[PDB]
């Protein structure tokens, strides 16, 4: 399921999961969603095209299933528009 969104980068992560390095961003749209990328700076206004992932995981403490949604950029792009 594809999504096209506009907003401001509020945070940046250089991270790792499942043997792969990833860059993540917090996009403020006020709500936020994480962008996951497998010239974008803090405070940049961006347009993002990618796949909306609900990304449900079981909470360690409550043992309840929650979504941890993200836009998957692989096909996909994030372009500075500010």
């Amino acid at each position, epitope marked *: 399921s594809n999504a096209l969104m506009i907003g401001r980068i509020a*945070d*940046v*992560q*250089h*991270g*790792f*999961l*499942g043997a792969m*390095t*990833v860059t*993540q961003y*917090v996009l403020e749209v006020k709500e*936020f969603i*994480v962008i*996951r990328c497998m010239q974008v700076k803090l405070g940049s206004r961006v347009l993002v095209q990618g796949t909306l992932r609900m*990304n449900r*995981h079981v909470d*360690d*403490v409550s043992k309840r299933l929650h979504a*941890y949604p993200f836009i998957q950029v692989v096909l996909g792009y994030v372009k500075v528009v500010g």
Partner: nanobody
Amino acid sequence: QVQLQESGGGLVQAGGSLRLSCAASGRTSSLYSMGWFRQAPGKEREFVAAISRNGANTYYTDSVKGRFTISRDNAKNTVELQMNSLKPEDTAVYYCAADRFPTMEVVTIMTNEYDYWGQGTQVTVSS
């Protein structure tokens, strides 16, 4: 609004072991990725080990792989570093750190992206 406090440091002989522990207090709900770092006098602070919020993903600097193990207890708000087969090269002040970046499974591996720091604990390994 977050305090990190290390414990478990000290002196050991080469080949020995230590277990470091870090306890998080205050606004712990804001914390996600947790990590251990180290710094020797006159040197830059370096990444040692880090662990995702959910504990599923870990990352280690090359020189500690197979020797150090990071783990966390989200019910106690602690993060721990089991250090086996210690070498003189591991001598440094060790710091625990916490990242506010909101992600369940992805571990932060960039030093400057961590937001809170403990006061540090000295680890010394004699030859």
